[PDB]
Amino acid sequence: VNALGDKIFEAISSMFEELKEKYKELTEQPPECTPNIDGPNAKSVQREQSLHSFHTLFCRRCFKYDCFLHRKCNYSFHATPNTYKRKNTETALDNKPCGPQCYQHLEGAKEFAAALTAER
């Protein structure tokens, strides 16, 4: 088709596949999108995309990535990546800030962070 003579009518006319071939030719003319963050080339993505590979390729039963004993054909909706096992969201804020620079050292930062988290 390239040698002759924009990619459908002329191709179908010359060849006649035929019309199907012309239509296919006209249509014709890491993949995870998570570059290694340890490497220099590393963009910024949300945690659901920066950890999707770890979540999908881990077996909680045998503690091995892509285990041989348990196989999942990705039939479920991403196998509930990490599900919601981080249920223990309870935490305690302590005094004695990090040092010369800290959110606790700056006045009002703690309340602002609490308000932002309290969007609900």
């Binding site: 040092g99 620079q101 800290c102 959110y103 050292h105 700056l106 930062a109 602002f112 962070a113 932002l116």
Partner: peptide, 20 residues
């Protein structure tokens, strides 16, 4: 790495809003 705690708080504030 690096990313001082005050810088971390500023980053958190900046990330707020915007978006048989």
């Amino acid at each position: 790495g690096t990313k001082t705690c005050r810088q971390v708080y500023e980053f958190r504030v900046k990330e707020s809003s915007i978006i048989n």
